[PDB]
């Protein structure tokens, strides 16, 4: 229902925009609109092998978004990449225009 789509609506956005989560992962080009019938499930790593794929009890979370937010290297990359996209996008638009005008005006 829409009541559950309004709870998993963020990690579906993360899976849609997989390609810009890690700068080294580089998926194959699909579109992936939200499928009509899906189900959100949790991986059971069993009690046979330890320590390799094991995410412990102290760091298991409830979405993909909390894991990506708990990752501190991804936070470094997202903040840095967002600041450089920001200062590229505000490169010559309006603060530049009015500081050029104030440069003309000051003398």
């Amino acid at each position: 229902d829409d009541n559950m789509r309004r709870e998993v609506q963020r990690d579906l956005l993360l899976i849609k925009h997989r390609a810009a989560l890690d700068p080294k992962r580089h998926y194959k080009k699909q579109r992936w609109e939200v499928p009509e019938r899906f189900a959100i499930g949790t991986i059971i790593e069993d009690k046979s092998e330890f320590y390799s794929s094991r995410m412990n009890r102290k760091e298991r979370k409830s979405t993909i978004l909390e894991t990506l937010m708990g990752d501190e290297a991804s936070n470094k990359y997202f903040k840095r990449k967002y600041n450089e996209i920001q200062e590229k996008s505000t490169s010559g638009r309006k603060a530049h225009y009015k500081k050029m005008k104030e440069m003309r005006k000051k003398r």
């Binding site: 963020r10 956005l13 993360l14 925009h17 390609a19 810009a20 989560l21 978004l65 990506l68 937010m69 997202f78 903040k79 990449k81 967002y82 996209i85």
Partner: protein
Amino acid sequence: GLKVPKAVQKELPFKSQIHQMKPQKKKTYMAKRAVVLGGDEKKARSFIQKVLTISKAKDSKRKEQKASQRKERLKKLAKMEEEKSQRDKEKKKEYFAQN
């Protein structure tokens, strides 16, 4: 942006009329009512925004780079097709000149 004058845009046809909506000056009740969540929710909002703009700027970089790729492939492809068509229109004249 394109600033179409008011004297022109009041005298436009019905299909060509420009939907320009005025800003809101009154603190309306739904805006003063509506709740926003804080802390973990505002950093989730910040995170989703950063992820979505990184995805959109990466896609724009990729499609601009593909545009720069395919215009020069168009250039070399048109040169090779012009050389080919020159060779065809001289081989046809050879064929008919022999026959």
